[PDB]
């Protein structure tokens, strides 16, 4: 019932040239300045989307590699920006970036591994950093980081699995911690986790698949849970989860595709969360990544687990089997 109405002059074509221009120029002040606490992830979003569009070369590799090395702390963890504190979120983003650039050597991999290992708790959960916040988002960050590094065996895998499964809910979904309500972002993190650790047989794909496909509103856009507004970044969170569990056809592909394209800004380029809002690189990545999962020919195939081009993951030989 809560939904947007898409206007009749909303963009209905894919404006790749404009999106690559938008990202290539991003960061040449306010919100920028203000989002510096997530810069490493911001860099990952821009680079990944450019690579999916065949334009990664237009970004600054050498500059990014120096920035990344400057963000690894003595504990082995990586921060969002220079002088900020290390966290699993930005350790993942950094490793995804280095993987895109085949430059893993730029940081101390042994120390990343020991950092991830040190944040696992007795129940198998992961804290995001030394201050102890527990979230299944960090379970995914931990195993996704380690998988890309070839070091999944560094953590207690069965305990980690048991924790994630203790976050499974009556509706087939997953939340932040045990007892937490189902949410598409957490569902992405947990199904991604279970793909990486070879535990998808433990998901009820029909039940969760149903909950996910019921995220699609009359507008064609997807929300993140019952009774919320659609948002372009669920084109990623919901669609990726559906793909992981083999139920992507449970969405109306054409209606979602029209919704996503309506979220483009035809003047600036980029995508916004919903039509006619302000554009950002986060929604630009997730819009483009959603279109690729839906089979858009001008965009490289994207991994639903790692949100990186499949050709990158093929190179590092990390491609978790999904549900057929």
């Amino acid at each position: 019932q809560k939904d947007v109405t898409i206007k009749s002059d909303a963009p209905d074509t894919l404006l790749l040239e404009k999106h690559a221009d938008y990202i290539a120029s991003y960061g040449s002040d306010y919100e920028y300045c203000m989002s510096e606490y997530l810069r490493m992830s911001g860099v990952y979003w821009g680079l990944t989307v450019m690579d999916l569009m065949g334009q990664l070369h237009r970004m600054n590799k050498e500059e990014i590699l120096v920035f990344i090395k400057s963000c690894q702390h003595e504990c082995g963890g990586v921060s969002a920006s220079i002088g900020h504190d290390p966290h699993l979120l930005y350790t993942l983003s950094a490793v995804q970036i280095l993987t895109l650039y085949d430059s893993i050597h730029v940081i101390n991999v042994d120390k990343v591994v020991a950092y991830v290992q040190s944040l696992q708790k007795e129940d198998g959960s992961f804290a995001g950093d030394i201050w102890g916040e527990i979230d299944t988002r960090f379970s995914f960050c931990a195993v996704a980081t380690l998988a890309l590094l070839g070091k999944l065996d560094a953590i207690n895998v069965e305990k980690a699995i048991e924790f994630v499964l203790s976050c499974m809910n009556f509706d087939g979904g997953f939340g932040c911690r045990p007892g937490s309500e189902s949410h598409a972002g957490q569902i992405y993190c947990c199904t991604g986790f279970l793909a990486i650790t070879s535990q998808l047989h433990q998901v009820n794909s029909d039940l969760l698949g149903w909950w996910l496909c019921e995220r699609q509103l009359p507008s064609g856009g997807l929300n993140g849970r019952p009774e919320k507004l659609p948002d372009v970044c669920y084109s990623w969170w919901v669609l990726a989860s559906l793909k992981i569990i083999g139920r992507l056809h449970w969405i109306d592909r054409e209606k979602l595709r029209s919704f996503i394209l309506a979220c483009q800004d035809e003047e600036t380029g980029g995508f916004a969360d919903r039509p006619g809002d302000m554009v950002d690189p986060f929604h630009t990545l997730f819009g483009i990544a959603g279109l690729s999962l839906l089979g858009e020919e001008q965009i490289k195939p994207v991994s639903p687990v790692f949100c990186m081009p499949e050709e990158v993951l093929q190179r590092v030989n990390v491609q978790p089997e999904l549900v057929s």
């Binding site: 203000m34 939340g175 937490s180 309500e181 496909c213 009774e227 919320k228 006619g276």
Partner: protein, 315 residues
Amino acid sequence: MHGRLKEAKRLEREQKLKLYQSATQAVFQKRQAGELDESVLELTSQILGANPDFATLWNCRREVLQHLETEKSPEESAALVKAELGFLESCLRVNPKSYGTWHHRCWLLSRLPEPNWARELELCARFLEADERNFHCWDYRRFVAAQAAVAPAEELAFTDSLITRNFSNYSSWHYRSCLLPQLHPQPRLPENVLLKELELVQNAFFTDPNDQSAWFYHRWLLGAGSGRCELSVEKSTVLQSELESCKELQELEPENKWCLLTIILLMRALDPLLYEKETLQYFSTLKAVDPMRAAYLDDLRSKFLLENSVLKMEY
């Protein structure tokens, strides 16, 4: 960022920036200098109010509070924690959905000798009456309930009032789904519990047939419970009664897809083979009413038809 709809305004924020930037600079200089003091707390208070997702600044506050506890009197430390609780609450008023703010409050409370958990449960009730879907607040409430050993039964009574007073109800039904199994444990719900729950959810979705949360919870009840098809006379009768009530509702709300799906599910729960004809008829009606779910509905129907072949081959 989300929900950002597309000189004095533009120059004001050029002024915000430059103060935020100088305050930020100053915090990091003080930190590298090892100056873990109140003036840090003053500097970060300015920044965290508007930018609570600046996680490193919450870490700085904790570093300061940790340090000051070492070299301040008990009474001075107590004053600092009470000031922090006030700061946190003022932050939650402007941005009630920040992971950093909720975590800092947990971190703080977990350290106290000492903590007034009843006051924290009340804080939850207030934030939940403002937004009954705020999962951060529900998570914090679960944390507080555990720390203070609040009994499942008490939390169950809290969910009832929330469900009946309105509306907006998914988070409260979800909580019930976790609470009930604790009251009636097992290493699946007991039938008497199940029947009461069915009566409660069925009130909900007849009261507001829109209200997707009751239908989602009801689908769970229908499987939790069971068990199978060794249906008691009472449960058999209750489910047949639900079936007819959904048919009535169908007549009243002919665009309501939730009641149609639920009719199909009820027939499955009652007698898959005896209701095969009607099940197939309902699938057609439902696909026409909810076309976006056509692929899902064909797959569900194919699953049920396979189940039906297997039942007939057990003859």
